[PDB]
Design a protein around this motif. Structure first.
Motif, PDB file in Angstrom:
ATOM      1  N   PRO A   4     -67.908  49.295 -80.013  1.00 55.09           N
ATOM      2  CA  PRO A   4     -68.651  48.153 -80.581  1.00 55.09           C
ATOM      3  C   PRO A   4     -68.747  46.968 -79.611  1.00 55.09           C
ATOM      4  CG  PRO A   4     -66.483  48.230 -81.474  1.00 55.09           C
ATOM      5  CD  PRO A   4     -66.664  49.560 -80.762  1.00 55.09           C
ATOM      6  N   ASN A   5     -67.828  46.850 -78.670  1.00 57.72           N
ATOM      7  CA  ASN A   5     -67.926  45.794 -77.629  1.00 57.72           C
ATOM      8  C   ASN A   5     -68.886  46.174 -76.448  1.00 57.72           C
ATOM      9  OD1 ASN A   5     -66.108  44.138 -79.105  1.00 57.72           O
ATOM     10  ND2 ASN A   5     -64.493  44.290 -77.546  1.00 57.72           N
ATOM     11  N   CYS A   6     -69.447  47.383 -76.506  1.00 62.58           N
ATOM     12  CA  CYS A   6     -70.468  47.774 -75.487  1.00 62.58           C
ATOM     13  C   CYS A   6     -69.877  47.829 -74.135  1.00 62.58           C
ATOM     14  CB  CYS A   6     -71.702  46.832 -75.556  1.00 62.58           C
ATOM     15  SG  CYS A   6     -72.531  46.766 -77.139  1.00 62.58           S
ATOM     16  N   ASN A   7     -68.641  48.270 -73.938  1.00 62.02           N
ATOM     17  CA  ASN A   7     -68.072  48.473 -72.634  1.00 62.02           C
ATOM     18  C   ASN A   7     -68.620  49.673 -71.877  1.00 62.02           C
ATOM     19  OD1 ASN A   7     -66.064  46.316 -72.954  1.00 62.02           O
ATOM     20  ND2 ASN A   7     -65.082  47.669 -74.345  1.00 62.02           N
ATOM     21  N   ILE A   8     -68.674  49.570 -70.572  1.00 60.85           N
ATOM     22  CA  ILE A   8     -69.018  50.720 -69.736  1.00 60.85           C
ATOM     23  C   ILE A   8     -67.941  51.782 -69.858  1.00 60.85           C
ATOM     24  CG2 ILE A   8     -69.544  51.550 -67.451  1.00 60.85           C
ATOM     25  CD1 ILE A   8     -70.506  48.665 -66.749  1.00 60.85           C
ATOM     26  N   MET A   9     -68.259  52.986 -70.215  1.00 62.20           N
ATOM     27  CA  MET A   9     -67.323  54.095 -70.340  1.00 62.20           C
ATOM     28  C   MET A   9     -67.406  54.967 -69.121  1.00 62.20           C
ATOM     29  SD  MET A   9     -67.713  54.780 -74.438  1.00 62.20           S
ATOM     30  CE  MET A   9     -66.316  55.873 -74.571  1.00 62.20           C
ATOM     31  N   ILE A  10     -66.288  55.598 -68.747  1.00 57.91           N
ATOM     32  CA  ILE A  10     -66.135  56.499 -67.640  1.00 57.91           C
ATOM     33  C   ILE A  10     -65.718  57.828 -68.171  1.00 57.91           C
ATOM     34  CG2 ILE A  10     -64.910  56.904 -65.459  1.00 57.91           C
ATOM     35  CD1 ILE A  10     -64.261  53.880 -65.488  1.00 57.91           C
ATOM     36  N   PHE A  11     -66.379  58.906 -67.788  1.00 57.34           N
ATOM     37  CA  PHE A  11     -66.122  60.259 -68.281  1.00 57.34           C
ATOM     38  C   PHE A  11     -65.671  61.148 -67.135  1.00 57.34           C
ATOM     39  CE2 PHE A  11     -67.543  59.770 -72.561  1.00 57.34           C
ATOM     40  CZ  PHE A  11     -68.355  58.636 -72.504  1.00 57.34           C
ATOM     41  N   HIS A  12     -64.779  62.124 -67.511  1.00 57.22           N
ATOM     42  CA  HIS A  12     -64.232  63.122 -66.592  1.00 57.22           C
ATOM     43  C   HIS A  12     -64.461  64.483 -67.142  1.00 57.22           C
ATOM     44  CE1 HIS A  12     -62.024  59.599 -65.082  1.00 57.22           C
ATOM     45  NE2 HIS A  12     -61.867  60.291 -63.990  1.00 57.22           N
ATOM     46  N   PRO A  13     -65.693  65.020 -67.215  1.00 56.69           N
ATOM     47  CA  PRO A  13     -65.941  66.345 -67.800  1.00 56.69           C
ATOM     48  C   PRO A  13     -65.180  67.405 -66.961  1.00 56.69           C
ATOM     49  CG  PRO A  13     -67.850  65.555 -66.475  1.00 56.69           C
ATOM     50  CD  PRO A  13     -66.918  64.375 -66.718  1.00 56.69           C
ATOM     51  N   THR A  14     -64.768  68.421 -67.746  1.00 57.85           N
ATOM     52  CA  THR A  14     -64.199  69.652 -67.118  1.00 57.85           C
ATOM     53  C   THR A  14     -65.339  70.467 -66.535  1.00 57.85           C
ATOM     54  OG1 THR A  14     -64.380  70.983 -69.100  1.00 57.85           O
ATOM     55  CG2 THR A  14     -62.268  69.764 -68.892  1.00 57.85           C
ATOM     56  N   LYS A  15     -65.036  71.515 -65.727  1.00 55.78           N
ATOM     57  CA  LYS A  15     -66.049  72.353 -65.215  1.00 55.78           C
ATOM     58  C   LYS A  15     -66.811  73.052 -66.303  1.00 55.78           C
ATOM     59  CE  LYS A  15     -62.974  76.263 -63.923  1.00 55.78           C
ATOM     60  NZ  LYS A  15     -61.913  75.909 -64.930  1.00 55.78           N
ATOM     61  N   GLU A  16     -66.173  73.414 -67.445  1.00 62.92           N
ATOM     62  CA  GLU A  16     -66.852  74.029 -68.529  1.00 62.92           C
ATOM     63  C   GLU A  16     -67.818  73.084 -69.263  1.00 62.92           C
ATOM     64  OE1 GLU A  16     -63.414  74.134 -68.119  1.00 62.92           O
ATOM     65  OE2 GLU A  16     -63.304  76.170 -67.350  1.00 62.92           O
ATOM     66  N   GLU A  17     -67.372  71.830 -69.401  1.00 63.04           N
ATOM     67  CA  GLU A  17     -68.169  70.781 -70.029  1.00 63.04           C
ATOM     68  C   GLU A  17     -69.359  70.378 -69.111  1.00 63.04           C
ATOM     69  OE1 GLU A  17     -65.016  67.903 -70.587  1.00 63.04           O
ATOM     70  OE2 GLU A  17     -64.592  68.727 -72.614  1.00 63.04           O
ATOM     71  N   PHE A  18     -69.307  70.684 -67.852  1.00 65.29           N
ATOM     72  CA  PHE A  18     -70.353  70.322 -66.829  1.00 65.29           C
ATOM     73  C   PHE A  18     -71.462  71.294 -66.860  1.00 65.29           C
ATOM     74  CE2 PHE A  18     -70.980  68.114 -62.524  1.00 65.29           C
ATOM     75  CZ  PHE A  18     -71.097  66.863 -63.095  1.00 65.29           C
ATOM     76  N   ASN A  19     -71.436  72.385 -67.650  1.00 69.63           N
ATOM     77  CA  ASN A  19     -72.492  73.337 -67.643  1.00 69.63           C
ATOM     78  C   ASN A  19     -73.747  72.936 -68.308  1.00 69.63           C
ATOM     79  OD1 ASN A  19     -71.259  75.465 -66.127  1.00 69.63           O
ATOM     80  ND2 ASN A  19     -70.134  76.125 -68.019  1.00 69.63           N
ATOM     81  N   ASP A  20     -73.679  72.357 -69.476  1.00 67.71           N
ATOM     82  CA  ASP A  20     -74.746  72.046 -70.307  1.00 67.71           C
ATOM     83  C   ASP A  20     -75.012  70.506 -70.288  1.00 67.71           C
ATOM     84  OD1 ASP A  20     -76.526  71.477 -72.487  1.00 67.71           O
ATOM     85  OD2 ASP A  20     -75.785  73.178 -73.635  1.00 67.71           O
ATOM     86  N   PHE A  21     -76.011  70.121 -69.505  1.00 69.13           N
ATOM     87  CA  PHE A  21     -76.283  68.668 -69.259  1.00 69.13           C
ATOM     88  C   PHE A  21     -76.636  67.975 -70.543  1.00 69.13           C
ATOM     89  CE2 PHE A  21     -79.051  65.141 -68.151  1.00 69.13           C
ATOM     90  CZ  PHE A  21     -78.335  64.533 -67.177  1.00 69.13           C
ATOM     91  N   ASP A  22     -77.619  68.489 -71.305  1.00 66.60           N
ATOM     92  CA  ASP A  22     -78.024  67.834 -72.496  1.00 66.60           C
ATOM     93  C   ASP A  22     -76.887  67.628 -73.486  1.00 66.60           C
ATOM     94  OD1 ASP A  22     -80.772  67.733 -71.581  1.00 66.60           O
ATOM     95  OD2 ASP A  22     -81.437  69.381 -72.987  1.00 66.60           O
ATOM     96  N   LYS A  23     -76.045  68.669 -73.650  1.00 68.50           N
ATOM     97  CA  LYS A  23     -74.938  68.614 -74.562  1.00 68.50           C
ATOM     98  C   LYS A  23     -73.952  67.486 -74.163  1.00 68.50           C
ATOM     99  CE  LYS A  23     -71.219  71.673 -76.515  1.00 68.50           C
ATOM    100  NZ  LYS A  23     -70.732  73.109 -76.509  1.00 68.50           N
ATOM    101  N   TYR A  24     -73.722  67.350 -72.870  1.00 65.59           N
ATOM    102  CA  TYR A  24     -72.759  66.309 -72.450  1.00 65.59           C
ATOM    103  C   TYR A  24     -73.321  64.898 -72.637  1.00 65.59           C
ATOM    104  CZ  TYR A  24     -68.443  64.547 -70.461  1.00 65.59           C
ATOM    105  OH  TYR A  24     -67.271  63.912 -70.301  1.00 65.59           O
ATOM    106  N   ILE A  25     -74.623  64.700 -72.403  1.00 72.85           N
ATOM    107  CA  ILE A  25     -75.211  63.381 -72.697  1.00 72.85           C
ATOM    108  C   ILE A  25     -75.017  63.080 -74.163  1.00 72.85           C
ATOM    109  CG2 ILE A  25     -77.336  62.034 -72.714  1.00 72.85           C
ATOM    110  CD1 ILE A  25     -76.222  62.659 -69.797  1.00 72.85           C
ATOM    111  N   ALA A  26     -75.342  64.069 -75.027  1.00 67.89           N
ATOM    112  CA  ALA A  26     -75.145  63.833 -76.454  1.00 67.89           C
ATOM    113  C   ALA A  26     -73.659  63.545 -76.789  1.00 67.89           C
ATOM    114  CB  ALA A  26     -75.652  65.057 -77.257  1.00 67.89           C
ATOM    115  N   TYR A  27     -72.739  64.221 -76.163  1.00 65.49           N
ATOM    116  CA  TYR A  27     -71.318  63.917 -76.375  1.00 65.49           C
ATOM    117  C   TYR A  27     -71.010  62.468 -75.990  1.00 65.49           C
ATOM    118  CZ  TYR A  27     -66.440  63.496 -75.644  1.00 65.49           C
ATOM    119  OH  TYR A  27     -65.106  62.969 -75.589  1.00 65.49           O
ATOM    120  N   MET A  28     -71.478  62.049 -74.797  1.00 60.24           N
ATOM    121  CA  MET A  28     -71.174  60.686 -74.375  1.00 60.24           C
ATOM    122  C   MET A  28     -71.697  59.664 -75.397  1.00 60.24           C
ATOM    123  SD  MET A  28     -72.197  61.438 -70.415  1.00 60.24           S
ATOM    124  CE  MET A  28     -72.390  59.677 -70.068  1.00 60.24           C
TER     125      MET A  28
END
Ligand SMILES: O=C(O)CNC(=O)C(=O)O
Ligand SMILES: [Mg+2]
Ligand code: NI
Ligand SMILES: [Zn+2]
Length: 331
Positions: A4-28
């Motif tokens: 809710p404070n609109c902070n910049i978030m930093i993500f560390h996807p695993t190699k498995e999570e790095f496969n599907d680009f659209d899915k990871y954007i939706a997760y973020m």
């Protein structure tokens, strides 16, 4: 509501999570990342964009741009003076020369201070907006030349097939090279990979607060605002963090390093600067959530913004009432 404070978030996807680009954007976005306007994605340690950067020196920068400032240190515009062509090896040597090289500094904060104090007194040369890619064709994950196209997304969401293509662009930077305050064309997403070299510092306004930045900009650049109702589409105005804070504008900042991705979200105003010689690659993309932002995006019709071939169809389908005026601006 997430983030809710609109902070910049930093993500560390695993190699498995790095496969599907659209899915990871939706997760973020499920975690509220878009509320900031910008997120960082650190690739898994197993990933690489290409094998080496040892063979890039012969790329041509056909139209290097000298970025000449006008105004005061915290509130200025820049115009782009076209220079003669040069190779990436020639441009790298120029970036490293005494005239252009990064000064001695203590840390990123000291260099940021120096940027805002001194930027206007120099005219750095930016190799921006070069069609092409540095991803190896065999890189299957987060390869910015192999993303789903925006034309395909529009067709999938709305059912209408349209002309146009969607390809990446390379940016060769040096100390003090600057990107002015802007959102993407048609308030699209962008993704930016810093392939090599020195960092890039970013500033961003949450999408929910973008109109506060626009109102400040009209006040600070009053001639430009009379000229055009969407003059930030010209991509020439700079406002410093100190001036934003004095005027109560919500924003955040972060520094991107080589090997890292940044994603900008629809209607996330951003600006920033390069620390020294570097090379970035970026492209626009869309998701289902973008369509409503595309329908509402402002547009420049004064003539100045002049854009790609593929924006025509986006305006024509999403904004038919504005189409005729916008297209006059293109002609
Ligand atoms: O790197 C730059 O000069 C500018 N990049 C962007 O505005 C972006 O990736 O959306
Ligand atoms: Mg080469
Ligand atoms: Ni951008
Ligand atoms: Zn305009």
């Amino acid at each position: 509501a997430q983030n809710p404070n609109c902070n910049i978030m930093i993500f560390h996807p695993t190699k498995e999570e790095f496969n599907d680009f659209d899915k990871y954007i939706a997760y973020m976005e499920s975690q509220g990342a878009h509320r900031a306007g910008l997120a960082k994605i650190i690739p898994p340690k197993e990933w690489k964009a290409r094998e080496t950067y040892d063979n890039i020196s012969e790329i041509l920068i056909a139209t290097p741009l000298q970025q000449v400032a006008s105004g005061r240190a915290g509130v200025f515009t820049q115009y782009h003076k076209k220079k003669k062509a040069m190779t990436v090896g020639e441009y790298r040597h120029l970036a490293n020369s005494k005239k252009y090289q990064t000064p001695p500094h203590q840390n990123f904060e000291d260099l940021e201070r120096k940027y805002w104090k001194n930027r206007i007194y120099n005219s750095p040369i930016y190799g921006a907006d070069i069609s092409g890619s540095l991803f190896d064709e065999n890189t299957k994950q987060w390869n910015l030349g192999h993303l789903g196209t925006i034309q395909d997304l529009l067709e999938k969401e709305c059912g209408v097939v349209i002309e146009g293509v969607n390809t990446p662009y390379l940016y060769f930077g040096m100390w003090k090279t600057t990107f002015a305050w802007h959102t993407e064309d048609m308030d699209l997403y962008s993704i930016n990979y810093l392939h090599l070299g020195e960092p890039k510092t970013w500033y961003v306004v949450p999408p929910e607060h973008g109109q506060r930045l626009e109102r400040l900009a009209r006040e600070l650049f009053p001639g430009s605002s009379r000229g055009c109702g969407a003059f930030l589409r010209h991509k020439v105005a700079l406002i410093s963090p100190t001036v934003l804070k004095e005027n109560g504008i919500p924003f955040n900042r972060i520094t991107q390093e080589a090997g890292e991705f940044m994603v900008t979200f629809p209607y996330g105003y951003h600006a920033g600067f390069n620390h020294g010689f570097n090379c970035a690659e970026a492209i626009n993309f869309a998701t289902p959530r973008w369509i409503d932002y595309g329908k509402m995006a402002s547009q420049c019709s004064c003539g100045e913004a002049r854009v790609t071939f593929s924006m025509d169809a986006f305006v024509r389908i999403l904004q038919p009432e504005r189409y005729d005026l916008w297209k006059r601006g293109q002609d």
